[PDB]
Design a protein around this ligand. Structure first.
Ligand code: K
Ligand code: K
Ligand code: K
Ligand code: MG
Ligand code: MG
Ligand code: MG
Ligand code: MG
Ligand code: MG
Ligand code: MG
Ligand code: MG
Ligand code: MG
Ligand code: MG
Ligand code: MG
Ligand code: MG
Ligand code: MG
Ligand code: MG
Ligand code: MG
Ligand code: MG
Ligand code: MG
Ligand code: MG
Ligand code: MG
Ligand code: MG
Ligand code: MG
Ligand code: MG
Ligand code: MG
Ligand code: MG
Ligand code: MG
Ligand code: MG
Ligand code: MG
Ligand code: MG
Ligand code: MG
Lengths: 122, 244, 157, 77, 38, 46
RNA sequence: CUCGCACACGCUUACAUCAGUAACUAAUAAUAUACUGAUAAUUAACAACCAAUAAACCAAAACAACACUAAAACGUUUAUUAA
RNA sequence: ACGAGCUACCCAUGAGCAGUUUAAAAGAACCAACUCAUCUAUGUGGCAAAAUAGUGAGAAGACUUGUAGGUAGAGGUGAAAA
RNA sequence: ACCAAAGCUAGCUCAACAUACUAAACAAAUACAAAAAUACACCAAAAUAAAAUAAAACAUUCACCUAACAUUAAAGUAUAGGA
């Protein structure tokens, strides 16, 4: 008979069966059947300038390590937002109603890169 | 290896944990009470003890209910607590005769009924026993509000009761916006069935419906850690302020 | 690169360092394949292991900044929406959500998937519990037997 | 007369609404909260879909009388 | 509404326990029908 | 007149008769999947 | 002595380069399309994927001129839309 | 429960029949491809769990044939051979 | 003298206790022909278990056989059975 314990891919079926191997679509079908490739859907790779950048893929052996401290949501708040809040409260300018000046954002849909929906791929 | 808790108690212990635990106590108390329904098909014997005609001795007798099958079609109407009777029979009523499968079905009728509490007409598939119970209770609204869940055996009936029970507790002025005097008369007769609001919206709910309702009330978006940390910082600052 | 060293670098710095690693990793992969073609060993193959470790550490630290910032703004643990569902087989499956331009009730394909267990699944769900119980029961008794066996051959107590 | 439609071929009519919707002053319990079908819960009734921004290909065809050149007089072409 | 009774006797269970039901306890006989009464 | 070759291969027929989609469309078919998952089969269906 | 090239359906690297075969595979030996190890490969123009609604239109394919009975697969144009 | 990828019948969608004889594409005639399997001989753990060689019947039809779909065991299907 | 012979671990069985019961893994893809990012929906359902067997045949009947809440006794007693 046939092998039921192998990978079912496009190469096994007839000419009708053409399954992609995992690529992301970059367009659709137009009027005449010519593939209309949308410019926006193409992933535009963004690269910096490494000419004036001094850093190497390897680190010196004599460079000491450090105590592995994973970043915590509490430590980040105490590092960035706490000094601004603390100074304002001591000066009497703290406003519990509005916290947008400290980096808090009520709704994510306003900004370009959401967080909970995870808009950006990487 | 054997189960520590018997299998028959798995469903009962399912109610003691999770979302089922946070359900209101009054709803759970009514659900766990499995009272024997009013006999419909079988004819019970009043006496607990009977004398054997052959033996001429005092013996104990017990009523055993006859199982009855309720088709899903019944839940859309009011059958009065009855349904299909599944069983066997003997042809010619002789023991030494053939054994035959027999199904007895109730005779269904199409009627539209009027409810004073809701002032709406419902075309409900009713049986002759349901109409007799309506006359016995001296009112369609009385029949729904007096017969318990085990006697009604219809999800439409429970929802119909819940709709009217909420109507009385809320005292909605929408029953008759133009006849306030008529509104007072209608709710005066059913004043004995008035129940508080927290009890009137859970009488017609099944187990699945209640869990969805409980989740909807408890559906809360997570509180951002920015708000939690701001409150923590303010407490320390006020604590330091009061320390000087 | 160790994890701690990359936390001191700025986000702009990490972006530039990723491509420096990227160009290094491509060269190492080219050399490794060329080694197989020439039937000769790859010169110091541990370089590739070091680079991929640096890549993973760089990915971890940026992800440590993304989730920490997400918790402050929104408080959600996972960046992809989802909910616990019970599939037709009776299991509990974490169903990740997908992006659609139309709501759930207007989707032909989505409305064909079923998230609930039919009554006949109850018996099969029960049997899976028994199978896992026996596997764990056998494992626990095996640990006891080894402890007794080793004590006899090592009576140092 | 003899209408040329056939009951089986024509699109079926929507299923009858659940009895809960017929009870005045009673909020039905639907499965729209969990955005998937569940037995024992009432079928939700949704308002017609209203896309905020119009899309050319995927929008419904505009009515003929919406065209600016539409005229009541019947011209033969 | 039909009214039926079992042909075969059911053994007792006097401590508030559900009695044992056998196949031969499913054999019913129609003793009276409520629609035929005057 | 010379039996023995009753199996004529076809991917369209094989995936339509014993496919994973068909197994999940009938209530009896789902029980087949459940039995094979319980037994520990490597391949539940084609 | 003569069932040859190609496509569809099916099989799934069994194909190619190099090396080895004491033994495994070929119903034997040489040996290698069939056994073992390493490396390599099939590049789209062909093929799959490849719009919706309303309206006009009784008039067969058989060299189709024109006909037979068993009454026949096979669409264009106008209008409104189409990233 | 699972089976109409073989087979019986049917619904879709396709594809084949060259020459010769006749006003004929007439369930006519000669004879290939093609489809059935009459008679005999080999074969009988065989090349083959039904074949090979010779010889035969139809070969513009109630004909062969590819792809895919439908009917499931108290049944399906059948130009009845249980 | 060939072919062979010997070993004691892998793990398993039956309980007990016991938390209270679908493990491990889920970055991406998974009910289009599963593991194929992306389009106007339909969605769903129940009807007593039967028989092999025992009565030396077999028709009424035939323990357990889905749902009991246990143990020492009442007791294999009262009753139910082509009795
Ligand atoms: K092959
Ligand atoms: K078929
Ligand atoms: K052969
Ligand atoms: Mg196989
Ligand atoms: Mg293919
Ligand atoms: Mg092919
Ligand atoms: Mg193109
Ligand atoms: Mg007792
Ligand atoms: Mg076979
Ligand atoms: Mg075939
Ligand atoms: Mg093979
Ligand atoms: Mg050879
Ligand atoms: Mg060679
Ligand atoms: Mg080779
Ligand atoms: Mg077929
Ligand atoms: Mg010819
Ligand atoms: Mg002829
Ligand atoms: Mg021959
Ligand atoms: Mg011959
Ligand atoms: Mg001869
Ligand atoms: Mg001939
Ligand atoms: Mg002839
Ligand atoms: Mg079938
Ligand atoms: Mg038959
Ligand atoms: Mg025939
Ligand atoms: Mg005959
Ligand atoms: Mg005969
Ligand atoms: Mg016998
Ligand atoms: Mg005997
Ligand atoms: Mg029996
Ligand atoms: Mg008697």
């Amino acid at each position: 008979g046939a092998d039921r314990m192998s990978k079912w891919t496009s190469k096994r079926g007839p000419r009708t069966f053409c399954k992609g191997r995992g690529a992301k679509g970059t367009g659709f079908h137009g009027r005449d059947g010519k593939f209309v490739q949308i410019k926006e859907m193409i992933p535009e790779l963004v690269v910096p300038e490494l000419a004036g950048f001094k850093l190497k893929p390897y680190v010196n052996y004599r460079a000491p390590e450090g105590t592995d401290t994973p970043l915590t949501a509490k430590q980040l708040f105490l590092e960035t937002a706490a000094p601004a809040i603390e100074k304002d409260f001591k000066a009497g300018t703290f406003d519990p109603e509005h916290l947008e000046k400290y980096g808090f954002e009520p709704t994510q849909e306003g900004k370009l890169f959401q967080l909970y929906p995870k808009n950006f791929p990487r | 290896p054997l189960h520590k808790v018997p299998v028959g108690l798995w469903k009962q212990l399912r109610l003691w944990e999770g979302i089922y635990s946070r359900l209101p106590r009054h709803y759970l108390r009514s659900l766990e009470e499995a009272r024997t329904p009013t006999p419909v098909h079988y004819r019970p014997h009043g006496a607990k003890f009977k004398i054997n005609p052959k033996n001429w001795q005092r013996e104990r007798v017990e009523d055993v209910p006859i199982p009855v099958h309720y088709p899903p079609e019944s839940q859309l109407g009011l059958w009065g607590g009855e349904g299909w009777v599944l069983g066997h029979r003997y042809v010619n009523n002789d023991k030494l005769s053939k054994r035959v499968r027999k199904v007895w079905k109730p005779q269904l009728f199409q009627r539209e009924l009027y409810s004073e509490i809701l002032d709406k007409r419902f075309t409900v598939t009713v049986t002759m026993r349901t109409l007799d119970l309506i006359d016995q209770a001296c009112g369609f609204d009385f029949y729904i509000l007096k017969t318990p869940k085990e006697d009604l055996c219809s999800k439409f009936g429970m929802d119909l009761k819940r709709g009217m029970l909420l109507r009385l507790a809320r005292q909605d002025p929408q029953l008759h916006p133009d006849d306030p005097a008529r509104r007072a008369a209608i709710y005066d007769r059913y004043k004995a069935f008035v129940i508080p609001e927290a009890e009137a919206e859970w009488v017609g709910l099944t187990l699945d419906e209640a869990v969805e309702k409980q989740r909807l009330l408890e559906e809360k978006d997570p509180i951002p850690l920015f708000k939690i940390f701001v409150e923590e910082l303010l407490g320390q600052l006020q604590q330091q302020a009061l320390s000087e | 690169w160790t994890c701690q060293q990359l936390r001191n670098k700025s986000n702009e710095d990490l972006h530039k360092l990723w491509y420096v690693l990227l160009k290094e990793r491509n060269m190492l992969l080219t050399l490794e394949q060329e080694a197989k073609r020439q039937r000769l060993p790859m010169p110091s193959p541990e370089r590739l292991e070091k680079v991929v470790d640096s890549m993973d550490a760089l990915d971890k630290v940026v992800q440590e900044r993304e989730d920490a910032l997400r918790l402050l703004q929104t408080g959600q643990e996972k960046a992809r929406p989802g909910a616990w569902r019970r599939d037709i087989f009776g299991r509990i499956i974490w169903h990740k959500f997908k992006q659609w331009p139309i709501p759930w009730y207007l989707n032909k394909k989505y409305n064909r998937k079923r998230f609930f267990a039919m009554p006949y699944v109850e018996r099969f769900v029960r049997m899976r519990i028994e199978k896992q119980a026996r596997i764990k029961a056998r494992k626990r008794s095996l640990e006891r037997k080894k402890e007794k066996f080793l004590q006899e051959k090592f009576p140092h107590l | 007369a003899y209408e040329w439609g056939v009951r089986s071929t024509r699109k079926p009519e929507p299923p009858p609404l659940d009895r809960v919707y017929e009870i005045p002053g009673l909020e039905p319990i639907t499965y729209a909260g969990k955005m998937h079908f569940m037995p024992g819960l009432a079928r939700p009734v949704f308002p017609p879909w209203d896309p905020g921004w119009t899309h050319p290909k995927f929008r419904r065809l505009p009515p003929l009388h919406e065209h600016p050149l539409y005229k009541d007089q019947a011209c033969y072409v | 509404t039909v009214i039926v009774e079992r042909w075969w006797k059911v053994p007792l269970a006097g401590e508030g326990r559900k009695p044992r039901l056998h196949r031969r306890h499913r054999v019913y006989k129609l003793v009276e029908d409520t629609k035929h009464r005057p | 007149k010379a039996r023995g070759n009753e199996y004529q291969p076809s991917n369209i027929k094989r995936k339509h008769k014993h496919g994973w989609v068909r197994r999940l469309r009938t209530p009896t078919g789902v029980q087949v999947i459940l039995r094979r998952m319980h037994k520990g089969r490597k391949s539940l269906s084609h």
